[PDB]
Amino acid sequence: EIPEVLVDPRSRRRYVRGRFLGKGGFAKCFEISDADTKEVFAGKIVPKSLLLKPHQREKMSMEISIHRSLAHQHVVGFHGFFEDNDFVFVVLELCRRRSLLELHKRRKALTEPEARYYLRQIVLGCQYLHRNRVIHRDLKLGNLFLNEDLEVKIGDFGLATKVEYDGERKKTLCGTPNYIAPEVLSDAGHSFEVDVWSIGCIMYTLLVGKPPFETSCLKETYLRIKKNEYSIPKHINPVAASLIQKMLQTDPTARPTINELLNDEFFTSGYIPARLPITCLTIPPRFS
Amino acid sequence: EIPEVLVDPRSRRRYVRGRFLGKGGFAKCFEISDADTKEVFAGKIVPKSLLLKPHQREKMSMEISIHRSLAHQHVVGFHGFFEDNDFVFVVLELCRRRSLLELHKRRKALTEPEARYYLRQIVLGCQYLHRNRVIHRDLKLGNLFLNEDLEVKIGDFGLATKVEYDGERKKTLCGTPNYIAPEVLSDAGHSFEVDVWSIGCIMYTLLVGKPPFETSCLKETYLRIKKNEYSIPKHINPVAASLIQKMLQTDPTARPTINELLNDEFFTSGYIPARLPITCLTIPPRFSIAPSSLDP
Numbered sequence A: 001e002i003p004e005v006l007v008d009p010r011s012r013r014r015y016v017r018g019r020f021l022g023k024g025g026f027a028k029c030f031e032i033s034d035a036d037t038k039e040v041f042a043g044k045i046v047p048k049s050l051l052l053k054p055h056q057r058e059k060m061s062m063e064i065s066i067h068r069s070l071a072h073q074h075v076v077g078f079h080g081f082f083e084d085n086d087f088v089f090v091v092l093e094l095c096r097r098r099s100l101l102e103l104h105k106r107r108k109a110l111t112e113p114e115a116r117y118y119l120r121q122i123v124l125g126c127q128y129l130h131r132n133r134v135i136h137r138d139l140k141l142g143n144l145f146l147n148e149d150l151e152v153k154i155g156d157f158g159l160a161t162k163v164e165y166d167g168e169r170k171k172t173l174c175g176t177p178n179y180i181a182p183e184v185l186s187d188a189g190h191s192f193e194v195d196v197w198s199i200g201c202i203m204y205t206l207l208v209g210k211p212p213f214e215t216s217c218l219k220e221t222y223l224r225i226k227k228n229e230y231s232i233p234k235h236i237n238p239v240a241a242s243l244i245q246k247m248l249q250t251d252p253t254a255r256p257t258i259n260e261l262l263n264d265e266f267f268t269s270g271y272i273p274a275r276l277p278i279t280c281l282t283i284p285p286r287f288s
Numbered sequence B: 001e002i003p004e005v006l007v008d009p010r011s012r013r014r015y016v017r018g019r020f021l022g023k024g025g026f027a028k029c030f031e032i033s034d035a036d037t038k039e040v041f042a043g044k045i046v047p048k049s050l051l052l053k054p055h056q057r058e059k060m061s062m063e064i065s066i067h068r069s070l071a072h073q074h075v076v077g078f079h080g081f082f083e084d085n086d087f088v089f090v091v092l093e094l095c096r097r098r099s100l101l102e103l104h105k106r107r108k109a110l111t112e113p114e115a116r117y118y119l120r121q122i123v124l125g126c127q128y129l130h131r132n133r134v135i136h137r138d139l140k141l142g143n144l145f146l147n148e149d150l151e152v153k154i155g156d157f158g159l160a161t162k163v164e165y166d167g168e169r170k171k172t173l174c175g176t177p178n179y180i181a182p183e184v185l186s187d188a189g190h191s192f193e194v195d196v197w198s199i200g201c202i203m204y205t206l207l208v209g210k211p212p213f214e215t216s217c218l219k220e221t222y223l224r225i226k227k228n229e230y231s232i233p234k235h236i237n238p239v240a241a242s243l244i245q246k247m248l249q250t251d252p253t254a255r256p257t258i259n260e261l262l263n264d265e266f267f268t269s270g271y272i273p274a275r276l277p278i279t280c281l282t283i284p285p286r287f288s289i290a291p292s293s294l295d296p
């Protein structure tokens, strides 16, 4: 059973469980508000019984360690964590318009300026992480959250890692990323370049309204990733289709860096809206 | 010197040596493909000079005799054997994802459903053997092979024996099993129950990411087996830990039969994936704690 009111022995601050938001994988997530301040946050409550298997205790510890060290306006605000004997409580920024998964599911393909709007904010968030020697390793629609004003906030640092030294490549992952990069598939070792691959996969989905490689069965899906088999519809704009091709390459070193990515003709020469209307979640907007 | 093309005087069928797979104990193993069919197999090429010591000639002959009599979808396909003056050539099913040893070495401990996934297939393979009065006597990660689709195929029948009548107990082994059962250690005589012991040792390793009894030196390892000294981490699920305790008992008669084993709450009440993704060989997959079969 989960307590109605969540108490923090450390800072003597206490919260009240609100509406059920859903299961964040291994977690049970609710709206919460501080007893005194009345400020609303997104609680992430993990059974400590599931954090008994060390392999899972490791993941949880690293997630909080990387996320609590990060403050950027396109990264989910980490507002603290604490635990009792039964649960671990993680207090995060509440993003009132959920994630790009919900948008994608409602809207399918977006307009090119909408695609561009969200993608710049994602790249900006990701450029901050990379600069702070952090690889997310699991960027997907589901963990790219939208605040009230449809500002993109990168969250879910479950599979994220910290690069210790210049040149480091990683092998081991405490979980299976949504978008498997070729160098993760082949277990070749990987670095920052995995994040560019997923942004390429994310860019494709936003413009095409379907994932690039995903098929009925996983065996064909992974074979397509291995041989770099995908088709960009003839209806996609050249410049954008070019930037997708640049990102979705078998060779990690061949892909743009997050810094080069942001300076693509797609971003520099294309129209970026300053603000999107809230109708964009359900109906395609007019720009012209 | 090993011939580039392997010729069979009997059936006039001929093969071409492919990539080197590795040394299968006493053997030298390669990919091979038939000249006409172009079908790819796993060759096992034994120097006949090593099959000169009778004790070794006996093993080899019995291995081929037991294995060539067996056909099951969780047993390595035996596709024939032949010899020249220098070598004995054994043609087996090619399992393109090697063995559980490679998985274990990469992944260490697996998720409980992964453990369950492989274990059901192992028990099924072993239930077929037992039904055909065959004790494997050397089940280990290294000889539990994985085909393209991650189906488990039991191979390596080097220490395997044929039970002549029901109730018969055996003593002599022309080799040392990876997982020594207590009744083999004490030379008390043994039967089908040894195979359950190794599955218990295999189950433990898959869930814990380390062997139950193995230590630095062998003297302590064998003393632990003799006294039944092992510890199940507090993090293992009760039902699974219970089934391990049932299998890893000093008394062979106390252990489940391969038929009772398959019907354990671990298997019947636990979630079994129908298929694993190929990423499972390198990265742990995520499973819902509520995995119902009433949604996509």
Ligand SMILES: CC[C@@H]1C(=O)N(C)c2cnc(Nc3ccc(C(=O)NC4CCN(C)CC4)cc3OC)nc2N1C1CCCC1
Pocket (backbone or CB within 6 Å): A020, A021, A022, A023, A024, A029, A030, A042, A043, A044, A076, A092, A093, A094, A095, A096, A097, A098, A145, A155, A156
């Ligand atoms: C805390 C975990 C994770 C995260 O990390 N952050 C940062 C987050 C920030 N903000 C939200 N916000 C909302 C999330 C879901 C909903 C929503 O509409 N929930 C309905 C509940 C009833 N159900 C039948 C249908 C869905 C509303 C949200 O804003 C109020 N969710 C977040 N999640 C998600 C929490 C559920 C999965 C993951």
Ligand SMILES: CC[C@@H]1C(=O)N(C)c2cnc(Nc3ccc(C(=O)NC4CCN(C)CC4)cc3OC)nc2N1C1CCCC1
Pocket (backbone or CB within 6 Å): B020, B021, B022, B023, B024, B029, B031, B042, B043, B044, B076, B092, B093, B094, B095, B096, B097, B098, B145, B155, B156
């Ligand atoms: C025939 C002996 C025995 C057996 O009985 N069967 C049935 C078997 C079926 N299939 C395989 N398949 C493969 C085994 C290894 C590899 C592999 O990746 N080998 C690498 C070669 C390069 N080297 C630097 C590192 C090792 C690939 C395989 O499939 C393509 N091996 C089998 N073995 C094993 C063969 C040596 C140990 C035992």
